[PDB]
């Protein structure tokens, strides 16, 4: 149960452990189940509610910076909270009506798989 502050002011809180050995590296495909929330409790996205996970390549700019920085510090199976500041998330614009300008996003993510 580390808490870790990393590039971007991104905070990783470890909720439940992974294998402690299998971590994603740049380029790796990662399969994630997540839930995204605003600082005010408002939920804004959830792969769990959709019944199917999210896949992406990591550290190639295909997801928010906070995930490129954050996901690779998790081990397979690990469940963690990422607290990602605006610049590492949707930025100074956000998506108006959904995500406020420069909003801090809280993600509860579980790394399910690395390839």
All structural domains of the chain: 1-115 (3.10.50.40)
Give the Cα separation of 60 and 44 in Å (integer): 24
Six-digit token string for 98 = 């959904």
**Rg of the Cα atoms in the chain:** 13
Q: Which residues contact 4 (CB under 8 A, 6 or more apart)?
A: 11, 12, 73
On whether the CB atoms of residues 50 and 43 are closer than 8 A, the answer is no
Report resolution (Å) to 1 decimal: 2.7
Place of tokens 């190639």: 60
H or E stretch at 65: helix 65-70
- Residues labelled as active-site residues: 34, 44-45, 64, 90, 107
Q: Torsion angle of alpha carbons 42, 51, 20, 84, nearest 10°?
A: -20
The β-bridge partners of 113 are 31
């Amino acid at each position: 149960a580390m808490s870790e502050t990393i590039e971007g002011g991104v905070k990783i809180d470890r909720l439940s452990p992974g294998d402690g050995k299998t971590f994603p590296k740049q380029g790796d495909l990662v399969t994630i189940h997540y839930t995204g929330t605003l600082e005010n409790g408002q939920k804004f996205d959830s792969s769990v509610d959709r019944g199917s996970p999210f896949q992406c390549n990591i550290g190639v700019g295909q997801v928010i910076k906070g995930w490129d920085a954050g996901i690779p510090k998790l081990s397979v199976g690990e469940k963690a909270r990422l607290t990602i500041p605006g610049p590492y998330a949707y930025g100074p614009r956000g998506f108006p009506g959904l995500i406020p300008p420069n909003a801090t996003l809280i993600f509860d993510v579980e790394l399910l798989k690395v390839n």
